[PDB]
Symmetry: none
Amino acid sequence: DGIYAAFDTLMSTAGVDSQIAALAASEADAGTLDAALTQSLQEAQGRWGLGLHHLRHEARLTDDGDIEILTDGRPSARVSEGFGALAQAYAPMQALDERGLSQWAALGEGYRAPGDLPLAQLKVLIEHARDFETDWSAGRGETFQRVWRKGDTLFVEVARPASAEAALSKAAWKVIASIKDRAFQRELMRRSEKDGMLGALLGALAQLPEAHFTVQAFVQTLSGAAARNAEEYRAALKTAAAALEEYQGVTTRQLSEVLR
Amino acid sequence: DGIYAAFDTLMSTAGVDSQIAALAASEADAGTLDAALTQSLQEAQGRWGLGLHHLRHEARLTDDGDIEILTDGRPSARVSEGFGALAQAYAPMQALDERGLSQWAALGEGYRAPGDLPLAQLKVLIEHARDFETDWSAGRGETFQRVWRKGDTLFVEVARPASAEAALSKAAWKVIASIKDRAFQRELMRRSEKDGMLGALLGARHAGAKANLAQLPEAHFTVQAFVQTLSGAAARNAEEYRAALKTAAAALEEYQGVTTRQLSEVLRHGL
Amino acid sequence: DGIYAAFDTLMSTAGVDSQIAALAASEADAGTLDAALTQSLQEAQGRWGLGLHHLRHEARLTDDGDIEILTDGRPSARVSEGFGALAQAYAPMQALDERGLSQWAALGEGYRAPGDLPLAQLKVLIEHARDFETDWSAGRGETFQRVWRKGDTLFVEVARPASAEAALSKAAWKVIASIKDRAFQRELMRRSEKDGMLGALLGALAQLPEAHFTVQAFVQTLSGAAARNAEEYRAALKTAAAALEEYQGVTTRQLSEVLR
Amino acid sequence: DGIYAAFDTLMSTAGVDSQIAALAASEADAGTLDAALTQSLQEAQGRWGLGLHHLRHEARLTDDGDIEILTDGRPSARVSEGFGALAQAYAPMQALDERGLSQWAALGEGYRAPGDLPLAQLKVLIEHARDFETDWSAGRGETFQRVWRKGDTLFVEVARPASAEAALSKAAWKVIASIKDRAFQRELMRRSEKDGMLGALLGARHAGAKANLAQLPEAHFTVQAFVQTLSGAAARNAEEYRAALKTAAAALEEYQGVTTRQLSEVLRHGL
């Protein structure tokens, strides 16, 4: 179950407990496995902060027993090629500004409401518009928020962009601070002075998916009448911010564990 | 030659100067004539007030020298069948409330906002929503309004519902008030108290006038609405929206007055 | 009990639980308090790694209710003048090399055995010499060791020199890594990038005794026949190394607590 | 003049050429004479083998023209009191074992290493210890050794214990073996079998010879030891230590042989 386990780690870098290997162990058929893979990939895309909401992300089993990742049904990458390869495949499809926020609109071509829109106007849009989308707006705790509705589903995205290097540095900091051996810790803190906690931990990388994917956002979804309710929108925004916090903490602790 | 003038008179009831007869006489190719017929009939559909904005309306020439009208690619009627036949074709696809307003949405399936939305909320929708539609207003008399945007075009519809019979009755009231023979007009009013003003007028017309009046398109079609369209940046302008609402209201009033005058001059010249 | 509490913190920087304020609260007389102060000062001198074993360190109550610190009976400093003042008073009496080890001999003038002495020769000196002293020798875990006998007491000193700046940096590292608030921690780690964890913690010093005194050594003492036994010497060396480790850990955790 | 020569003869029993009489005749000031007396007597104390290294030995002139000997600043005897009186003064401060070796330590209170310490351990002590002392060796016959360092000076003491009576007995054996009168020597041996060889010799001496022999310092003092001293770097040299041990042993042998010859030439010249 090598490819299944690799997909499991790829999902775990986004805080997704896909359990794909366990599902394959239960003699699940190709369709059920593909549906689970696609659901996990969509969940992880909602958290990676790549800004590809305009594309349909799917994952399927191939004839040779591999897992293929596709965008809009177009073959994008395969797991056997490595996680860095899949990041390289995703890169040209992205468009990021200096803040790490996606410049693409989730609804594609069409009007986009300004990010500095007053809350009363946003309430009007929520209650009475058909489809709408807002640009990135500043939020609490150095985060950014936006919202868009497609059909009968309202998506609220809260993002704090973060490079993989920063998360690796934070995890290495925590790991170095948590070392029980005094002399070993003093040596690592000494090497850190010269090569960062990066070369401190490594001296004591691309294969690990955490070097390419880290949690940067979270998308919460409302459906039905809840999609047209301001109370539900605010509740979803709060839950999305809390989920971003929780999943970033989970991923940083997981990275610390894997570096230990 | 006759069918083209018949189409022209059908369009004239909706205020459309199609000039199809002139285009036919100019020996224009088929595609141009079908395009002109389709554009004229689509223009007239927004004025007849049938509430069929969700259907695609087309008109094309057929092999046997007639004009065929189609909705959603499905044939509906031929012009030679008569105007009442066209009305009977359009009727089962209508859904009107007690006020004479269409209950169908212009955008089809989807959310429609309530009517009488405050200027602030409607302004937010106009400036920042992608596509939207509102229900009919409460009314300012027998005049109602609604607005919907599709893609890059905003449509403001102002409708004063009126059947062809209602317009003919208004014209009949006008001509009876215009009659200088006081005894004759008093007699006509005495018969009207029993048989309706329209029926009283028709009873004093020529022999077989009812059969000679069903041949006119105005007995089945009349102006019930006016749609004013904005495009581009003006489609997202609340000021342009309210100005277009006023423009459509004034245009509807002018058109209905013109139909009233024409129907009065027809009923008086009858007998 | 301000001066008593200040002396208590001064002893706590060496890991000494002097409890001087509690003793003064029990209406202890001047002699008992002075004896306790002198014992605590000697214990702290054994751990500060200042290399002043050749001097007699005493502490006494003054007529005005202060505490006076003396070397060889000569007034050296007073607690009311501050801990930095006492460090300044101790500084000219010191002699330290590039490794942070004291160059002074604990027995004063006289012969000093080389630090690279073979262990059999050291055993002979332990069993049959009257008084002896060895220079600093390298030991396990980046530590250094030396031994000397005066009269009927054998002292084994194990030292890992460490500046107060390094201990402060290590404590700030631990405190930053232990912060429960994610955004606050990210801000501190960001400021650290520019001003060290020093300005990171301070921006969110000389008055605190930890800025001037930190644990650098430990001295274990044997008496009687145990002073002339090689087994006892090796056991004392092991206990001294373990005590150095334990007290350095205790002081670093205490400094982390006081910076939190 | 007599007391100075008496001190000289007292020193001669320990191999010290004090020349106090010449210094007195040279009219040297008091301080010089006291210093010379003290140095000579301290030199003789290390050869008499009384084991009083822990005491400070001094000699000084007094008001009445005599010489007073002091230990630790306490007066002990005057030279005019006789040499036996000086021996009786020194005796209660001694502590000798059955071998004639002093049980007192040279460094006083403190640790003393066992004797017969292997060359390696003793070498470590010599090179790296500050101050140390060892007990007496097992002996190589009646000759014993020990070593102690104080400050910058190392002392190696080699002792062959012998009372003045023992040295006189050895000299008596020598002179009796030297006697050419075979009948006389056989008679002396016959009396010696009963009264000791020394007593047999003294019985054949002059009248009142025992009273005429107590006036000689050699009846109470004799060479029992030799101390060789190293200073400075040589005080921390094991090779210098062993060389000094050999030097002290040879010097002790030479000194005791000289005393034996002198005592024999005195006993023979007696009668």
